[PDB]
Motif scaffolding. Sequence first.
Motif, mmCIF file in Angstrom:
data_model
loop_
_atom_site.group_PDB
_atom_site.id
_atom_site.type_symbol
_atom_site.label_atom_id
_atom_site.label_comp_id
_atom_site.label_asym_id
_atom_site.label_seq_id
_atom_site.Cartn_x
_atom_site.Cartn_y
_atom_site.Cartn_z
ATOM 1 N N UNK A 109 0.803 -1.216 0.000
ATOM 2 C CA UNK A 109 0.000 0.000 0.000
ATOM 3 C C UNK A 109 0.839 1.271 0.000
ATOM 4 N N UNK A 110 2.113 1.190 0.378
ATOM 5 C CA UNK A 110 2.958 2.371 0.398
ATOM 6 C C UNK A 110 3.183 2.888 -1.023
ATOM 7 N N UNK A 111 3.265 4.209 -1.198
ATOM 8 C CA UNK A 111 3.469 4.755 -2.551
ATOM 9 C C UNK A 111 4.804 4.382 -3.174
ATOM 10 N N UNK A 112 5.802 4.001 -2.373
ATOM 11 C CA UNK A 112 7.134 3.746 -2.913
ATOM 12 C C UNK A 112 7.115 2.547 -3.855
ATOM 13 N N UNK A 113 6.461 1.457 -3.445
ATOM 14 C CA UNK A 113 6.425 0.275 -4.299
ATOM 15 C C UNK A 113 5.581 0.506 -5.546
ATOM 16 N N UNK A 114 4.489 1.269 -5.432
ATOM 17 C CA UNK A 114 3.701 1.602 -6.615
ATOM 18 C C UNK A 114 4.514 2.427 -7.603
ATOM 19 N N UNK A 115 5.263 3.412 -7.104
ATOM 20 C CA UNK A 115 6.116 4.205 -7.982
ATOM 21 C C UNK A 115 7.190 3.341 -8.629
ATOM 22 N N UNK A 116 7.781 2.423 -7.859
ATOM 23 C CA UNK A 116 8.797 1.535 -8.412
ATOM 24 C C UNK A 116 8.219 0.653 -9.510
ATOM 25 N N UNK A 117 7.030 0.094 -9.282
ATOM 26 C CA UNK A 117 6.401 -0.730 -10.300
ATOM 27 C C UNK A 117 6.036 0.056 -11.545
#
Length: 470
Positions: A218-226
């Motif tokens: 749910x953290x934005x960091x992993x979404x941005x990385x993906x």
Amino acid sequence: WGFLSAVIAIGGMQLLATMDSTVAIVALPKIQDELSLSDAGRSWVITAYVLTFGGLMLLGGRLGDTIGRKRTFIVGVMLFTIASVLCGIAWNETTLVTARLLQGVGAAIASPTGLALVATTFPKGPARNAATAVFGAMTAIGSVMGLVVGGALTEVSWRWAFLVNVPIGLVMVYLARTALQETNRERMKLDAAGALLATLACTAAVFAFTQGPESGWLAPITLASGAAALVFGLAFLIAERNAENPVVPFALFRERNRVATFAAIFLAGGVLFTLTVLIGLYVQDILGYSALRAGVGFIPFVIGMGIGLGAASQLVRSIPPRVLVIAGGILVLGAMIYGSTLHRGIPYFPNLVLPITIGGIGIGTIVVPLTLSAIAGVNLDRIGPASAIALMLQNLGGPLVLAVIQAVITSRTLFLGGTTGPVKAMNDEQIGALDAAYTYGLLWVAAVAVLVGAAALFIGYTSQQVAHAQ
């Protein structure tokens, strides 16, 4: 006579490739106690390895016909040994992280070249099947030896636990330099324009996969990385579709059987990695047996893989690979069925050793033909990329299914009753619920293996085509 001096020399990369991972996983608390490292400390200690193993995977696979084959493998093991000895002689977090980064770079340079070399040598026939069996027994032996070393040499000092690579690495370089045939004169430059983009995309993907479970999806960091990984892959395909020497050619993707084999390898690697992580957690948490005796307990796993591996390598030439994969899936399913009736305090034998050795036999019988058909006599310009694709899928499948399987296990633990935390968790009444959750997750892993078998049924490759002679 030289058959051995070739097969161990080629396949021994997996020794370190699994030993270092297992030893690091074992010695994380010792390193945290020794050096001023936090949980994020060991987290990045393993993250460096996975990043430099995934990001350089495709470039490492393509690093052929430019530097060479034997020279590539030798420089890979040299980097691995130097990075491990630098890990041994460490005095700060930064130097340890740099050593781990170099270790991952060397491993990513070397590991795809292992399959590329076992495909270039031993063209087709008994030699290829025997060499693939040596490969499987090699990774199994590396894993068990890593477990044993991590259990045994941890009370003295972790410096030896990381230093043990140097003797093995040195003898490996001895056999590699002495008994690995030099490649013929065949040079061909590579276009780094798509290579750098593919490396960056793989690095971003591995970044996201590693940082997911650390702080949740749910953290934005992993979404941005993906998102970065997806746009990088899109640009890579756009700039690579019209490349003279693509990093990942689409020629291998124009055959239905090859796509089926790659999907089967992806799913089977995922199910295997999930299975071994689950069994390791079960052995090291509920049974309470420490790694010093856990290595001995998992020795029968290696014995079973060895016997099943020899059997499969012997009988591939006469029976089609699809039914072999199906039979291996049936054997592994039976192993899971036998192990589903497991609780704390069960007798050691034959309650536990028999399912473990059955699973080993099944794993060997499924890992012979899958890796035998991944390298299916493609032209020498794509064999390296094919091996890189195979290893990339094998590594990528694992966490993809393990995340959801462990989420299901934790959900079952919460529903039945329990707490997430340190050893022994909450009051002892929840250990039974935890075993029930582990068995439920094991059944889900069995369902995933059923999916693996269903996908592998689509493999239309005949035994006489890629196995026997040509």
